[PDB]
Design a protein around this nucleic acid. Structure first.
Ligand code: ZN
Length: 229
RNA sequence: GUUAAAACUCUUCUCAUGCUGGAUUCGAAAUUAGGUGCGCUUCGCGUUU
């Protein structure tokens, strides 16, 4: 097991809508998965076939959680929309969003300059050979996460491709960094599969668990995530 | 293989109006149209009582 670390920053702003006209503050790992699968199909890579597999259970993408001037990731504030890093507060929040009115199109973005965590957890080392190639393409051109990729919104640039290994969590009690798939969890989560080869945009809805919640689970390996805490 | 994809903050509107490169100072200070050359040459106040 290993992971590729990164201080992924935004060249142009990203627009990710949620339900209830909510715009997400930071970019999520689902968006990274959806973009990297387009990369692997576009470069005729084999893992693209696994990219259209939503339960491959290797190459799991952790959320692009924002990084602070404290050098640490903003830990998500428990049961709250905004985030707060363990060192100081520096609290992210909505102020970073801007209401956009552009040619009829009224939407929102999140501004550029803030840095976000790259963390691609990979299990199979055979997949790491293609993983080095896809992080090496982004290294040259960039990745686009958001809406209006063809208009140019969402351009991301890595500044630190680091393939440093890691180990899973220890405590059973873990904090939910990202929203987790837990049935009858009363926190509705929506994403989609596009399947551009065969069309049929999906808009898959679910009722998983929300982020910022301490939960005890001995059967935990750590799209939810496990914070060691 | 991103609750996607698709949609150019676009159109209209002259940095314009008002203000003179003007005021002061003389082309005049120095220099004699001067120097050379003879109105000369020729002809008796005759004749007549
Ligand atoms: Zn901080």
């Amino acid at each position: 097991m290993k992971e590729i670390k990164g201080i992924l920053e935004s060249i142009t702003g990203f627009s990710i809508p949620l339900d209830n006209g909510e715009y997400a503050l930071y970019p999520a790992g689902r968006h990274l998965r959806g973009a990297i699968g387009y990369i692997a199909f576009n470069l005729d890579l084999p893992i693209s076939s696994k990219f259209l597999d939503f339960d491959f259970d290797d190459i799991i993408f952790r959320d692009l959680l924002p990084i602070s001037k404290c050098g640490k990731i903003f830990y998500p504030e428990k049961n709250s929309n905004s985030l707060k890093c363990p060192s100081c507060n520096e609290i992210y929040g909505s102020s970073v969003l801007r209401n956009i009115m552009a040619r009829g199109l009224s939407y929102k973005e999140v501004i550029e300059g803030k840095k976000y965590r790259l963390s691609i957890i990979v299990k199979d080392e055979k997949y790491l050979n293609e993983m080095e190639a896809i992080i090496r393409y982004i290294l040259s051109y960039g990745i686009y996460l958001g809406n209006k990729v063809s208009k140019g919104y969402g351009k991301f640039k890595i500044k630190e491709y680091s393939i440093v290994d890691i180990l899973p969590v220890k405590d059973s009690e873990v904090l939910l960094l990202s929203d987790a798939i837990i049935d009858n969890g009363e926190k509705d989560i929506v994403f989609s599969k596009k399947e551009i080869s065969s069309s049929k945009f999906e808009i898959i809805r679910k009722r998983g668990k929300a982020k910022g919640d301490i939960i005890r689970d001995n059967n935990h390996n750590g799209f939810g995530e496990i914070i060691s805490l």
